[PDB]
Design an enzyme around this catalytic site. Structure first.
Site, short mmCIF file in Angstrom:
data_model
loop_
_atom_site.label_atom_id
_atom_site.label_comp_id
_atom_site.label_asym_id
_atom_site.label_seq_id
_atom_site.Cartn_x
_atom_site.Cartn_y
_atom_site.Cartn_z
N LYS A 11 57.64 38.32 4.74
CA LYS A 11 57.83 37.88 6.12
C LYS A 11 56.64 38.37 6.94
CE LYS A 11 61.31 38.41 9.82
NZ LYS A 11 62.62 39.10 10.10
N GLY A 47 59.68 30.62 11.51
CA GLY A 47 60.63 30.86 12.56
C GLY A 47 59.93 31.08 13.89
N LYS A 48 60.76 31.40 14.89
CA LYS A 48 60.23 31.75 16.21
C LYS A 48 59.30 32.96 16.12
CE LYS A 48 63.27 31.62 19.83
NZ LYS A 48 63.94 31.94 21.13
N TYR A 49 59.57 33.89 15.21
CA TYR A 49 58.89 35.17 15.20
C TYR A 49 58.20 35.51 13.88
CZ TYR A 49 61.36 36.14 19.55
OH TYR A 49 61.83 36.10 20.84
N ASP A 106 72.29 38.61 15.80
CA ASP A 106 71.86 37.27 15.42
C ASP A 106 72.60 36.82 14.17
OD1 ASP A 106 70.46 34.93 15.91
OD2 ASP A 106 68.68 35.58 14.77
N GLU A 113 56.63 33.86 9.72
CA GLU A 113 56.53 32.90 8.63
C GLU A 113 56.97 33.61 7.36
OE1 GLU A 113 52.59 31.23 8.39
OE2 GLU A 113 53.20 29.51 9.62
N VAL A 114 57.70 32.89 6.51
CA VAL A 114 58.33 33.50 5.34
C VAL A 114 57.78 32.84 4.09
CG1 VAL A 114 60.50 33.84 4.12
CG2 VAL A 114 60.39 34.20 6.57
N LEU A 121 57.95 29.24 2.70
CA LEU A 121 59.35 28.83 2.70
C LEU A 121 59.84 28.37 4.07
CD1 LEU A 121 60.74 31.73 0.50
CD2 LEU A 121 60.28 29.39 -0.26
N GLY A 122 59.26 28.87 5.14
CA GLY A 122 59.72 28.48 6.46
C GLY A 122 58.94 29.22 7.53
#
Ligand SMILES: COc1cc(/C=C(\C#N)C(=O)Nc2nnc(C(C)(C)C)s2)ccc1O
Length: 328
Positions: free
Chosen positions: A66, A46-48, A154, A50-51, A43-44
């Site tokens: 995640k 990120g910086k920290y 955040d 993968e989802v 799905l995506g």
């Protein structure tokens, strides 16, 4: 040196908790069975992390996985401990399981599935009533986590998942969240640029839950005025200039003078002198149906330079802006 600061609420929640509650470096992870989860699609990234969307093959239900990128075991245990502390709280994303991913050699966190509409398109259709409703739902999550000694750090549209069909909201990505301890100095390199509080932008480290309330105010401004993001800085310095063009430079100086803070001297040639503005100048014919006197007053009471002057989450829930929201 800088003048110290304390949260005006939930100040001592963690000092009276047992040490295991906030001492995340000693947390012992209880691992599930990695074979329970079959990855379906990415799905995506990120910086920290993968989802992934996945299936829990013990109940054939969809979940979200995640997989964390390699970072300090400290930052990983922090997020895990915070998710377990907050699990079951109102509108907090539910950590369902934790497994060892054999490919990444990192933990993979398994979350409840939220059938979310992207904020890019969702924010185009939200009504006045929708915005008040979902703001109230976010406040339930923030009051909960603040009441539990945790600041999210955040808050931004990307971390507020909304299943608009069922009017269900979840606050996600607790990877930057921290425990609040009175007098502790924190890293100012948190939050996304457009949602950073003045305290981060002037390098004041002794901040608290009220940081989240600035971020929330930034989200509200983008929603009711239909300008996303609202404060649209090109870097962290220009970000503070954009804020000062609205809240004014005299109150910025009052803020830093109260805490005996010094501005970065690089502001001497970019900051200028700016009056404080009235919020009505951002109202126009294409957003006026989202604006009310209650909305402007609520917004005005979130977006304060002085973190000690902002509404708390619980105070915000008392605000007349939410009188029209149907209570359950
Ligand atoms: C990035 O940290 C987190 C992320 C999540 C979850 C998501 C993200 N990001 C997520 O669920 N994203 C989705 N995007 N599309 C979806 C469908 C409805 C199409 C299945 S779900 C949960 C907890 C976290 O800590």
């Amino acid at each position: 040196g800088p003048v110290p600061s304390r949260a005006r609420v939930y100040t001592d929640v963690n000092t009276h908790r047992p040490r295991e509650y906030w001492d995340y470096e000693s947390h012992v992870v209880e691992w599930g069975n990695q074979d329970d989860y079959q990855l379906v699609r990415k799905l995506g990234r990120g910086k920290y992390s993968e989802v992934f969307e996945a299936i829990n093959i013990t109940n054939n239900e969809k979940v979200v996985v995640k997989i964390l990128k390699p970072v300090k075991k400290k930052k990983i245990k922090r997020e895990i401990k915070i998710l377990e502390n907050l699990r079951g709280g109102p509108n907090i994303i539910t950590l369902a399981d934790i497994v060892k991913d054999p490919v990444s050699r990192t933990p993979a966190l398994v979350f409840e599935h939220v059938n979310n509409t992207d904020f890019k398109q969702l924010y185009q259709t939200l009504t006045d009533y929708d915005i008040r409703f979902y703001m109230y739902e976010i406040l339930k999550a923030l009051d909960y986590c603040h009441s539990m000694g945790i600041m999210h750090r955040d808050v931004k549209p990307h971390n507020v998942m909304i299943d608009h069909e069922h009017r269900k909201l979840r606050l996600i990505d607790w990877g930057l969240a921290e425990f609040y301890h009175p007098g502790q100095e924190y890293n100012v390199r948190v939050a996304s640029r457009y949602f950073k509080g003045p305290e981060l932008l002037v390098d004041y480290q002794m901040y608290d839950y009220s940081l989240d309330m600035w971020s929330l105010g930034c989200m509200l401004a983008s929603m009711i005025f239909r300008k996303e993001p609202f404060f649209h800085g090109h870097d962290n310095y220009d970000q503070l200039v954009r804020i000062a063009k609205v809240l004014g430079t005299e109150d910025l100086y009052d803020y830093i003078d109260k805490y005996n803070i010094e501005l970065d001297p690089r502001f001497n040639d970019i900051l200028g002198r700016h009056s404080r503005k009235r919020w009505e100048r951002f109202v126009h014919s294409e957003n006026q149906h989202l604006v009310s006197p209650e909305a402007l007053d609520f917004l005005d009471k979130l977006l304060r330079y002085d973190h000690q002057s902002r509404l708390t989450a619980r105070e915000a829930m008392e605000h007349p802006y939410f009188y029209t929201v149907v209570k359950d």
